[PDB]
Design a protein around this ligand. Structure first.
Ligand SMILES: COc1cccc(Nc2nc(N3CCS(=O)(=O)CC3)nc3c2cnn3C)c1
Length: 828
């Protein structure tokens, strides 16, 4: 089993047995603590359903999809060898019903995909079916034998200390210091709990040298017993802020931190990295600090009610005053009757006092209203952010998540994984939760893998914790998937090498095109796996490369344009699988943005609205490097312009409509392309405005020959958004005018906008989290408070409607101005 731990390590990209960077045994302890949850989920999953991983949903079929059906008669073409026959099926009839309705043990696998139509669920509740109906595609399935469940086989007293807590600051040491002669530095020690500072003590400013000694006893104002579980000893060096490092004061065994510590610190407000209990691995170049330290048990007046309700009604980002907190607390039993008051109520708690925390735990023991309340993801997410370090509080959040069906877990998987960074300890209810769902479902497990590996590869701050979690998963996912992952990682590594090697050698000369195709030839020949799963789409199995179609794109970061053949013989079309390999950008920012877009879509699904967004696949695999899905038949908006007038930025209003008339043959399809455009344009206008990324160069905007608009390059990020005159022309308008299509556009936008405001809290918390865990450069107070204004928090539906309509009018008044300006900067 020695080559087994080796296998996991090479699959993880980090050695979880390496104890070189620890000052305790929390990590190793967590490895053991996860064994039970690991085996408890492996021994309780249905082998058959787990092997076929049916992808289903319990949500009602949207309205725009019901009208796609004729007589409640959905046609399903079945194949078995070379023959084939169609069948009329009831949307409410099970796959089993269809089976007996066919013969009148075999299962219905989807053609070309590793997807299965199995289980006791209506045919209308399969994602693949809903996908087909939406795209007007025809459902084709092949009849073959169920996968062998054998292939999944798995390898067999603190409260008696009244003393004021204190820490001795021996000094700070650094091998080599910056060439900035010569500043002064002091050490600032904070006792934190959920980004809430309980006490703060500094040292005296000393001359900045490679060795600074203090030997100073910093005595805090907080007693030892009043120390809460999860409290952090935050040590920071100023000059302003240069270094930081954290130390849990209460360990994973409820023991008060004791003894000597030499901690290596991180170099440089609301960043999630600043919360980590991990120390800097680089011991030879990093700043170090030396400290010294020397078990934990387990009727209202009318006016006041109005006041409390008003408080409870405010948005998540609305600051609580001292008065507000005192009201919430004093009336905590009434506040408990409102689930939406929980985040605010638990922010009113003084965790710096044992007596209060005790009363708080008494309160939580009375969870009847919370338990019986319906799941509010936005509300549940709020309790898992940086503002809550109490495991009891956070546990009741993870509690409500338990009722999520695999469908919704996939919706919030990425950000749930990111929320692990907010956990005080490596072992958490959230961590075990992700682990559980990952083992219960292959699709969730697949993406869990890549999301964790994403962080492990380019995050020294949390790679250790995530490595321990990933290892736990890999020891239960099964032999089959362990093999898949292995193949996937192999091909990725090989391709990333080629990407970097190519980038080294603006024009794409022949010497590079030859070298690329040359390199790809060497790999495909006895060096590359014959087949592998597409990481951003586990259903697809890629095969051999199409070297003829492979190229280096004309961008300054020289991304690889790759094309594969579907390794599945039963595949219908002969289209290639397109993947863009790129180094230079942080694709983690793209993942989050795209994930948010998918969330905005499902939200619109609840309102029976359908904006035709194109949230393509984008997986971050390493440092400034990852893969992208290639959308077929798509070109840049700016490129459609460059066709007529390339060099100069002399943009013309009509080109777009011409380009569409050209790429559609029947004129009927042209109208379907225009309508598709009007919707896709509306959605991307609304979604982009809310996220504050609407001001882009139309080179970062693309369109499908079918009229499907969609943005790209979100790493890179005046007008509210992009509504240029050429788009407007396709809508049948130019200046002081209108159109049957423009009236439509304005209608769909207001619908979409008002629909998102119905999930304000949920968007706010996701946006806030996005900045803190994914965008190190965008983590200020005002950076997050943008989305409040964007969603017009605390406004009438009418006002908001007009507010956005004004934003639209701003695009009309600007015309090509901002685009032309983009043309001067980006182009020149
Ligand atoms: C100038 O732009 C061009 C030119 C030619 C083809 C394309 N191809 C694409 N480019 C991008 N961007 C994001 C990923 S990138 O940074 O590696 C490349 C840009 N996304 C795309 C496609 C096709 N599908 N999707 C989702 C773009």
């Amino acid at each position: 089993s020695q080559a087994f731990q080796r296998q996991l390590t090479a699959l993880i990209g980090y050695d979880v047995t390496d104890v070189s960077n620890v000052h305790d045994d929390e990590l190793e302890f967590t490895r053991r603590g996860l064994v039970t949850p690991r085996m408890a989920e492996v021994a309780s999953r249905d082998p058959k359903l787990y092997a076929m991983h049916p992808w289903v949903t319990s949500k009602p079929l949207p309205e725009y999809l019901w009208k796609k059906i004729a007589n409640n008669c959905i046609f399903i073409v079945i194949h078995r060898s070379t023959t084939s026959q169609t069948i009329k099926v009831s949307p409410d009839d099970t796959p089993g019903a269809i089976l007996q309705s066919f013969f009148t043990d075999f299962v219905l696998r989807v053609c070309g995909r590793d997807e299965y139509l199995v289980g006791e669920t209506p045919i209308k509740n399969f994602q693949w079916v809903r996908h087909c109906l939406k795209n007007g595609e025809e459902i084709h399935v092949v009849l073959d034998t169920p996968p062998d469940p054998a292939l999944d086989e798995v390898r067999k007293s603190l409260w008696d200390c009244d003393r004021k807590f204190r820490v001795k600051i021996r000094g700070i040491d650094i091998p080599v210091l910056p060439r900035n002669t010569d500043l002064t530095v002091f050490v600032e020690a904070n006792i934190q709990h959920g980004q809430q500072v309980l006490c703060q003590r500094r040292t005296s400013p000393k001359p900045f040298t490679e060795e600074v000694l203090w030997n100073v006893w910093l005595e805090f104002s907080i007693k030892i017993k009043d120390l809460p579980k999860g409290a952090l000893l935050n040590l920071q060096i100023y000059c302003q802020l240069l270094y930081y490092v954290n130390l849990l004061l209460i360990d994973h065994r409820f023991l008060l931190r004791r003894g000597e510590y030499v901690l290596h610190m991180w170099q440089i407000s609301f960043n999630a990295d600043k919360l980590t209990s991990a120390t800097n691995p680089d011991k030879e170049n990093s700043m170090s600090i030396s400290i010294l330290l020397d078990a934990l048990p387990k009727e209202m007046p009318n006016q006041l009610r109005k006041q409390l309700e008003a408080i409870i009604a405010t948005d998540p980002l609305n600051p609580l005053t001292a008065e507000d907190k005192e009201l919430l607390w004093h009336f905590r039993y009434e506040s408990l009757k409102h689930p939406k008051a929980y985040p605010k109520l638990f922010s009113s708690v003084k965790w710096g006092q044992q007596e209060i925390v005790a009363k708080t735990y008494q309160l939580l023991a009375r969870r009847e209203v919370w338990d019986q309340s319906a799941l509010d993801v936005g509300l549940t997410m709020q309790l898992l952010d940086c503002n809550f370090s109490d495991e009891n509080v956070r546990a009741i959040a993870v509690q409500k998540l338990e009722s999520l069906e695999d469908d919704d877990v996939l919706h919030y998987l990425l950000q749930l994984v990111q929320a692990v960074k907010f956990e005080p300890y490596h072992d958490s209810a959230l961590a075990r939760f992700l682990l559980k769902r990952g083992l219960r479902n292959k699709r969730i497990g697949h993406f869990l893998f890549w999301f964790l590996r994403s962080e492990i590869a380019q995050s020294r701050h949390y790679q250790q914790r995530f490595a321990v979690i990933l290892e736990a998963y890999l020891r239960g996912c099964g032999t089959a998937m362990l093999h898949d992952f292995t193949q996937q990682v192999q091909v990725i590594e090989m391709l990333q090498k080629v990407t970097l090697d190519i980038k080294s050698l603006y024009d794409v000369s022949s010497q590079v095109i030859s070298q690329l195709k040359q390199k790809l030839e060497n790999l495909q020949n006895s060096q590359l796996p014959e087949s592998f799963r597409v990481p951003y789409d586990p259903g697809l199995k890629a095969g051999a490369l199409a070297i003829e179609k492979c190229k280096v794109m004309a961008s300054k970061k020289k991304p690889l344009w790759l094309e594969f053949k579907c390794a599945d013989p039963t595949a219908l079309s002969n289209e290639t699988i397109g993947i863009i390999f790129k180094h230079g950008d942080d694709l983690r920012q793209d993942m989050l943005i795209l994930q948010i877009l998918r969330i905005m879509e499902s939200i619109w699904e609840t309102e029976s609205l359908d904006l035709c967004l194109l949230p393509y696949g984008c997986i971050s695999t390493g440092d400034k490097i990852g893969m992208i899905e290639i959308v077929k038949d798509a070109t840049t908006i700016a490129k459609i312009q460059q066709s007529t007038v390339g060099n100069t930025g002399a943009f013309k209003d009509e080109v777009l409509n011409h380009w569409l008339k050209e790429k559609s043959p029947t004129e009927e399809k042209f109208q379907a392309a225009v309508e598709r455009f009007v919707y896709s344009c509306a959605g991307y206008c609304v979604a982009t405005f809310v996220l504050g990324i609407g001001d882009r160069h139309n080179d970062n905007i693309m369109i499908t020959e079918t009229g499907n608009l969609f943005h790209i390059d979100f790493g890179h990020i005046r007008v509210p958004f992009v509504l240029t005159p050429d788009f407007l022309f396709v809508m049948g308008t130019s200046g002081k005018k209108t159109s049957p299509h423009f009236q439509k556009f304005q209608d769909i936008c207001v619908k979409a906008y008002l629909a998102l405001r119905h999930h304000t809290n949920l968007l706010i918390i996701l946006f806030s989290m996005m900045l803190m865990t994914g965008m190190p450069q965008l983590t200020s107070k005002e950076d997050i408070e943008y989305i409040r204004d964007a969603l017009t928090v605390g406004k009438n539906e009418e006002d908001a409607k007009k507010y956005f309509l004004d934003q639209i009018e701003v695009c009309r008044d600007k015309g090509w101005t901002v685009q032309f300006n983009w043309f001067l900067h980006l182009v020149l």
